[PDB]
Amino acid sequence: GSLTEDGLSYKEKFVVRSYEVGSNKTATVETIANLLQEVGCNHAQSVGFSTDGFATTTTMRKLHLIWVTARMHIEIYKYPAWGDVVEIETWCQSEGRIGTRRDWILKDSVTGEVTGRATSKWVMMNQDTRRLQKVSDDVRDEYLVFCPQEPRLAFKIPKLEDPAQYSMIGLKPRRADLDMNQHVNNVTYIGWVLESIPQEIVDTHELQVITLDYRRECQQDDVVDSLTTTTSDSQFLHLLRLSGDGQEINRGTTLWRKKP
Amino acid sequence: GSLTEDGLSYKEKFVVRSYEVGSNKTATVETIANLLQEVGCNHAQSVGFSTDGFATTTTMRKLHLIWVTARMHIEIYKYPAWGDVVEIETWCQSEGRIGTRRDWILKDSVTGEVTGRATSKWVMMNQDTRRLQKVSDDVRDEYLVFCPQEPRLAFKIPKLEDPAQYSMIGLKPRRADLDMNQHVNNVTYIGWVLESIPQEIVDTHELQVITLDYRRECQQDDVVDSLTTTTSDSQFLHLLRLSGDGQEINRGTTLWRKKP
Ligand SMILES: C[C@@]1(COCc2c(F)cccc2F)CC(c2ccccc2F)=NO1
Numbered sequence: 238g239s240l241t242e243d244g245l246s247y248k249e250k251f252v253v254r255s256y257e258v259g260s261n262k263t264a265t266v267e268t269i270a271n272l273l274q275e276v277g278c279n280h281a282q283s284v285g286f287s288t289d290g291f292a293t294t295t296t297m298r299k300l301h302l303i304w305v306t307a308r309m310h311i312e313i314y315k316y317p318a319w320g321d322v323v324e325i326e327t328w329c330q331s332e333g334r335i336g337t338r339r340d341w342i343l344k345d346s347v348t349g350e351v352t353g354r355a356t357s358k359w360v361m362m363n364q365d366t367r368r369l370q371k372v373s374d375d376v377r378d379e380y381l382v383f384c385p386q387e388p389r390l391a392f393k394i395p396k397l398e399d400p401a402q403y404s405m406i407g408l409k410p411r412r413a414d415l416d417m418n419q420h421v422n423n424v425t426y427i428g429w430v431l432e433s434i435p436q437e438i439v440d441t442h443e444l445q446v447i448t449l450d451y452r453r454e455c456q457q458d459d460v461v462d463s464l465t466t467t468t469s470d471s472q473f474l475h476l477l478r479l480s481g482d483g484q485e486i487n488r489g490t491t492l493w494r495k496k497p
Numbered sequence: 498g499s500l501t502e503d504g505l506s507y508k509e510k511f512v513v514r515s516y517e518v519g520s521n522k523t524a525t526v527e528t529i530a531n532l533l534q535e536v537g538c539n540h541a542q543s544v545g546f547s548t549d550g551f552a553t554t555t556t557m558r559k560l561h562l563i564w565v566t567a568r569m570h571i572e573i574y575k576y577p578a579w580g581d582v583v584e585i586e587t588w589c590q591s592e593g594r595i596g597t598r599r600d601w602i603l604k605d606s607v608t609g610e611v612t613g614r615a616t617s618k619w620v621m622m623n624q625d626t627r628r629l630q631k632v633s634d635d636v637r638d639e640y641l642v643f644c645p646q647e648p649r650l651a652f653k654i655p656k657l658e659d660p661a662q663y664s665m666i667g668l669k670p671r672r673a674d675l676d677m678n679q680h681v682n683n684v685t686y687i688g689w690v691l692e693s694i695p696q697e698i699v700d701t702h703e704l705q706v707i708t709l710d711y712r713r714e715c716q717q718d719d720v721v722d723s724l725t726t727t728t729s730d731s732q733f734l735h736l737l738r739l740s741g742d743g744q745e746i747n748r749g750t751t752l753w754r755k756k757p
Pocket residue numbers: 273274275276277278280281282284286291292304328329337338339359380383384
């Protein structure tokens with residue numbers, strides 16, 4: 238991949254792998270989310286962020302701050318097949334004191350058609366206490382020079398009430414689910430949300446839209462319950478909570494289209 | 498990737514991704530095993546096997562036969578870092594009536610040095626009954642023309658006895674663990690074997706050698722126990738068994754080197 242001529246966005250092509258596809262031999266949404274993360278990381282490196290950790294500015298490092306995902310919204314029009322080339326363009330924009338947005342557009346590299354879109358809200362937090370911080374002028378000024386400054390857009394979740402229609406309990410991360418800092422990878426939470434979708438829905442529908450809020454992390458030694466209720470196309474409300482009716486981890490919604 | 502000039506092996510380069518690395522920012526062994534699978538699948542397509550299923554010959558399809566892994570042996574000298582290019586060369590050889598071998602050699606694409614080696618024994622089995630079959634002349638003759646015929650080599654596991662020194666119980670696959678035919682991906686079994694290795698070993702050692710036998714599949718709805726005992730460098734004996742002291746799934750051994 239590479240920066241675009243103006244230096245304010247990044248493009249990368251990916252060839253969909255054998256193990257990245259599901260039963261229709263198209264990329265899973267977890268594969269798409271992994272590719273979104275990878276092109277974001279390669280963008281960060283291309284504009285001078287670290288080649289051996291996740292992106293931080295100089296002032297973030299001084300203050301022990303990291304970027305963490307607060308919300309992810311993905312819409313897929315067509316999932317790419319095994320062996321297809323998908324090209325993803327990504328960019329960031331300042332969200333003032335709130336945080337930082339990363340947007341993505343997915344294209345079929347052969348047709349040039351848009352096959353999906355995504356946006357994410359990232360917030361600052363202290364890596365040790367996990368307490369949120371507003372973006373200071375020093376941190377914003379460090380990264381603003383890598384962002385378009387005029388708007389460039391790729392485009393409330395309620396709490397599931399007991400009893401859940403569907404559940405998958407006792408979900409636990411294995412080492413493959415952990416990132417280079419031994420934190421649960423953000424894509425693992427997408428997989429866990431979808432685990433409580435009945436298999437018959439997955440067999441007969443394609444996921445068109447997912448919206449996920451990220452409230453708290455699952456630690457390596459935590460156990461998660463995935464809860465789903467039908468709200469309808471098929472639409473669902475989702476809640477991930479720590480085992481034992483503990484803290485909410487994630488809430489979300491999905492929209493599914495019947496297979497052709 | 499592409500076939501080599503003589504058409505009898507296949508090479509592919511991979512750039513190690515952000516989510517493919519562990520805490521030392523080098524590829525996990527599960528990442529390496531996924532890359533071995535992907536280059537094998539791309540080799541199969543390059544010599545005229547299907548672009549929308551795992552490799553079968555014409556006679557295999559007529560008889561409802563598939564290739565399944567019986568044994569995997571991987572040795573890694575150096576795990577590639579995040580953003581490094583690893584080049585993998587792969588080839589197959591007939592094993593007479595027993596099955597078919599796939600071998601791999603991993604190289605650091607910048608230095609050209611060998612960083613790892615792998616070999617696998619694949620057997621025929623009926624996809625419906627899971628009963629093994631010897632390779633018939635018709636099937637061997639269909640694939641022999643894609644193999645070196647003179648030897649080209651990249652280079653008994655006992656049953657763990659109760660009580661196991663270490664365990665991880667209740668492991669269950671999620672949809673990301675399933676392949677395009679809704680079978681548990683072979684790399685998932687490597688992850689499950691390693692889950693019962695204590696975290697302190699993983700934190701202080703690198704895996705140098707893994708040998709894994711594959712006896713039976715975990716179904717989507719099965720639950721697996723991972724059992725490990727120290728036999729020693731650190732060496733371990735491994736057993737994966739279905740929950741409830743059910744059927745053995747896998748047995749294996751690993752050898753670990755202290756981190757520099
Ligand atoms: C918010 C975040 C910022 O990344 C650094 C960065 C800029 F700040 C401005 C322009 C380009 C750029 F790269 C963090 C982030 C991220 C973090 C970890 C993993 C994956 C990611 F995409 N992706 O976007």
